[PDB]
Design an enzyme around this catalytic site. Structure first.
Site, mmCIF file in Angstrom:
data_model
loop_
_atom_site.group_PDB
_atom_site.id
_atom_site.type_symbol
_atom_site.label_atom_id
_atom_site.label_comp_id
_atom_site.label_asym_id
_atom_site.label_seq_id
_atom_site.Cartn_x
_atom_site.Cartn_y
_atom_site.Cartn_z
ATOM 1 N N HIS A 153 40.297 18.603 48.403
ATOM 2 C CA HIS A 153 40.905 19.824 48.908
ATOM 3 C C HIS A 153 41.495 20.586 47.724
ATOM 4 O O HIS A 153 42.666 20.972 47.718
ATOM 5 C CB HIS A 153 41.913 19.518 50.014
ATOM 6 C CG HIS A 153 42.163 20.665 50.948
ATOM 7 N ND1 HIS A 153 42.178 20.514 52.319
ATOM 8 C CD2 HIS A 153 42.457 21.964 50.707
ATOM 9 C CE1 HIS A 153 42.464 21.679 52.872
ATOM 10 N NE2 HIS A 153 42.637 22.576 51.927
ATOM 11 N N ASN B 14 36.305 25.431 59.991
ATOM 12 C CA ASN B 14 37.580 26.106 59.817
ATOM 13 C C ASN B 14 37.358 27.549 60.246
ATOM 14 O O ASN B 14 36.511 28.247 59.671
ATOM 15 C CB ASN B 14 38.059 26.056 58.374
ATOM 16 C CG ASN B 14 38.469 24.675 57.934
ATOM 17 O OD1 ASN B 14 38.457 23.712 58.704
ATOM 18 N ND2 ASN B 14 38.835 24.574 56.671
ATOM 19 N N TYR C 49 39.172 31.261 61.236
ATOM 20 C CA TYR C 49 40.304 32.177 61.238
ATOM 21 C C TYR C 49 39.951 33.580 61.713
ATOM 22 O O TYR C 49 40.745 34.190 62.420
ATOM 23 C CB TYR C 49 40.915 32.273 59.828
ATOM 24 C CG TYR C 49 41.566 30.975 59.394
ATOM 25 C CD1 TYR C 49 42.898 30.716 59.701
ATOM 26 C CD2 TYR C 49 40.850 30.013 58.700
ATOM 27 C CE1 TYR C 49 43.503 29.541 59.298
ATOM 28 C CE2 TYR C 49 41.438 28.824 58.320
ATOM 29 C CZ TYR C 49 42.779 28.596 58.632
ATOM 30 O OH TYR C 49 43.423 27.443 58.235
ATOM 31 N N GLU D 150 40.409 23.397 61.183
ATOM 32 C CA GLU D 150 41.543 24.287 60.954
ATOM 33 C C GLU D 150 41.423 25.513 61.843
ATOM 34 O O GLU D 150 40.338 26.097 61.977
ATOM 35 C CB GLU D 150 41.609 24.856 59.532
ATOM 36 C CG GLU D 150 41.805 23.827 58.460
ATOM 37 C CD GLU D 150 41.930 24.359 57.048
ATOM 38 O OE1 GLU D 150 42.138 25.573 56.852
ATOM 39 O OE2 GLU D 150 41.838 23.531 56.109
#
Length: 440
Positions: free
Chosen positions: A118, A290, A292, A349
Site C-alpha cells: 500500500h 475501490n 469513490y 474501499e
C-alpha cells in the site's frame, strides 16, 4: 434489503497512513518518508511520523472495530518494517509485531484482510529506479513469500497491490505522490513492473503458503460516461476508461494491454514480451474494487494525456474533495460481472471526506457521510439482485488519518481522530453503520 448472512463487513486502513513509529523496531525509510519530509509536497506541512500512532495503539483500533460490530479489518503490512533495505535480510521484529496484531484481531473475532503493498516502497529500491526496474518486481515477490510463510497459517485473504494506477501514474507521471517523478514513459514502465510484481508474488505466495490462500488485487475503478454522444466525447470517455480501468483489468484477465491505448501511447508504451503477460494473468481468487467517483468526460485536445476533462455536475452532492454518484457503483459492478472473469468481488474501499468537527455535545454529526453509505449500500443490493457475486464491503477509513498529499487535512474516517491527543471517537455515521450491520 437483506445481505447474505456471511457477508464481510469491515473498515480499511493503510500502514503509512496510521502507524507512525517510523523509526521504531528497525523500520527502514520508505518513499513516503522521503516525500513527506520534502518541503512543499504535503498540503499542510504534516508527515506520517506519528499519524494515528497505530503501531502502539492498534488495541484501541481493535476496540473501535468491535464497538462497530464489524467482522473484518483490511490493513496493510509495511514492507520497510519487514525488509528494511527492500532487498536483503528480514527484520524478524517487524514480522513479530504483525503476528501479535493478527492474533489480537483473531482473538476479537475480526478476520484480517491483508494488503502487502500500500505504496510504502523501501527507499533503497527507489534509489535503484523503484518501479522503473524489473528487479523491484522480483524482490516484491520475495517479500510476499516471507510474509505468507509467517502469517499464512492464520490469514487466508491477501491482496498483493492496492491501486497500482495511483502508484504508477500519480507517483511517476503526475508527480503528486511519492516518489514524485513527472515522466509518462516512467509511469507506464512502473505500471508494467507493478503488474509483473503482482504476478510473481501470486506464484510465490501459493508456493510458500502453509494452507490454501485466497489471493486478490485491489484496483480503483472509475466508471466513465461521455458528456454527449458526439464522436469526440465518446472517444474521450473511451480513452479515460482505458487510462484508468482497462489498462489494468485487461492484462489481469489474460487479454494483454488494450490495443487502443497501446496505439495512443505509442513509443511511451512499455515493452511487454509475452512471458510477462502470462505471469501477470496468474489466476486470482477474488478482486477488490475501490469505488469513490465517476468521470463524466468531455474531449480536451489541448489538455494533457488522456485529453479528457471532467464535466462537473453542480446539481449532485459534493464532499470535501469529490462528486457523489452512487449509481456508478452499480454500473461498474455489473460491467465486471458481465464482461470480466474475476469473481467473487469485494468492495475494498468506499467512503468520503468531510470537514468534520466535534460538536458541543461531543459527537460528530456527519449526516452527509451517513447518506453516502446508505446510498452506496442500496446500490450493492441492486447489484446482488442482478447476480453479481459480491462477498463484502469495507468502509474507507476506520479512522481519520494521514491522507497522502493532503496530509491530516482530509478526514475520511468513520471515527474521528484528534491528532494532538490521539483520542478516537465514533462519528454518527459509524453508529449508523453499527446499527445497520446489527440489523443484518
Amino acid at each position: 434489503e437483506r445481505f447474505p448472512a456471511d457477508f464481510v463487513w469491515g473498515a480499511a486502513t493503510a500502514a503509512y497512513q496510521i502507524e507512525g513509529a517510523v523509526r521504531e523496531d528497525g523500520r527502514g525509510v520508505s518513499i513516503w518518508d522521503t516525500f513527506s519530509h520534502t518541503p512543499g509536497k504535503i498540503a499542510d506541512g504534516t508527515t506520517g511520523d506519528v499519524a494515528c500512532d497505530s503501531y502502539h495503539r492498534y488495541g484501541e483500533d481493535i476496540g473501535l472495530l468491535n464497538a462497530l460490530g464489524m467482522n473484518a479489518y483490511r490493513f496493510s503490512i509495511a514492507w520497510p518494517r519487514i525488509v528494511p533495505l527492500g532487498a536483503g535480510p528480514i527484520n524478524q521484529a517487524g514480522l513479530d509485531h504483525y503476528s501479535r496484531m493478527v492474533d489480537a484481531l483473531l482473538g476479537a473475532g475480526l478476520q484480517p484482510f491483508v494488503t502487502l503493498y500500500h505504496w510504502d516502497l523501501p527507499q533503497p529500491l527507489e534509489d535503484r529506479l523503484g518501479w522503473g526496474s524489473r528487479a523491484t518486481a522480483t524482490v516484491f515477490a520475495e517479500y510476499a513469500d516471507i510474509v505468507v510463510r509467517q502469517l499464512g497459517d492464520r490469514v487466508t485473504h491477501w491482496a498483493t497491490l492496492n491501486e497500482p494506477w495511483c502508484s504508477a501514474m500519480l507517483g511517476y507521471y503526475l508527480g503528486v505522490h511519492a516518489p514524485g517523478h513527472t515522466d509518462l514513459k516512467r509511469g507506464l514502465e512502473a505500471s508494467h513492473n507493478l503488474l509483473l510484481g503482482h504476478g510473481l508474488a501470486v506464484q510465490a505466495m501459493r508456493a510458500a503458503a502453509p494452507q490454501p490462500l485466497q489471493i486478490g488485487i485491489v484496483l480503483n475503478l472509475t466508471p466513465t460516461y461521455p458528456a454527449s454522444d458526439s464522436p469526440e466525447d465518446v472517444a474521450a470517455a473511451r480513452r479515460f476508461d482505458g487510462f484508468v480501468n482497462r489498462w489494468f483489468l485487461d492484462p489481469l484477465a489474460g487479454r494483454g494491454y488494450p490495443q487502443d491505448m497501446l496505439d495512443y501511447y505509442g513509443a511511451a508504451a512499455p515493452q511487454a514480451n509475452p512471458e510477462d503477460l502470462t505471469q501477470i494473468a496468474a489466476p486470482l481468487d477474488w478482486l477488490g474494487v475501490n469505488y469513490y467517483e465517476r468521470m463524466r468526460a468531455v474531449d480536451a485536445p489541448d489538455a494533457s494525456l488522456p485529453q479528457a476533462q471532467r464535466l462537473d455536475d453542480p446539481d449532485l452532492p459534493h464532499t470535501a474533495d469529490r462528486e457523489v454518484y452512487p449509481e456508478g457503483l452499480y454500473d461498474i459492478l455489473l460491467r465486471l460481472h458481465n464482461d470480466y472473469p474475476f469473481r467473487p468481488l469485494y468492495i475494498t474501499e468506499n467512503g468520503c471526506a468531510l470537514h468534520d468537527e466535534i460538536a458541543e455535545d461531543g459527537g460528530i454529526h456527519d449526516g452527509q457521510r451517513q447518506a453516502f453509505f446508505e446510498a452506496h449500500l442500496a446500490q450493492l443490493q441492486r447489484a446482488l439482485a442482478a447476480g453479481v457475486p459480491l462477498k463484502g464491503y469495507f468502509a474507507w477509513s476506520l479512522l481519520d488519518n494521514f491522507e497522502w498529499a493532503m496530509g491530516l487535512s482530509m478526514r475520511y474516517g468513520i471515527c474521528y481522530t484528534n491528532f494532538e491527543t490521539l483520542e478516537r471517537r465514533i462519528k454518527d455515521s459509524g453508529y449508523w453503520l453499527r446499527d445497520f450491520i446489527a440489523g443484518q
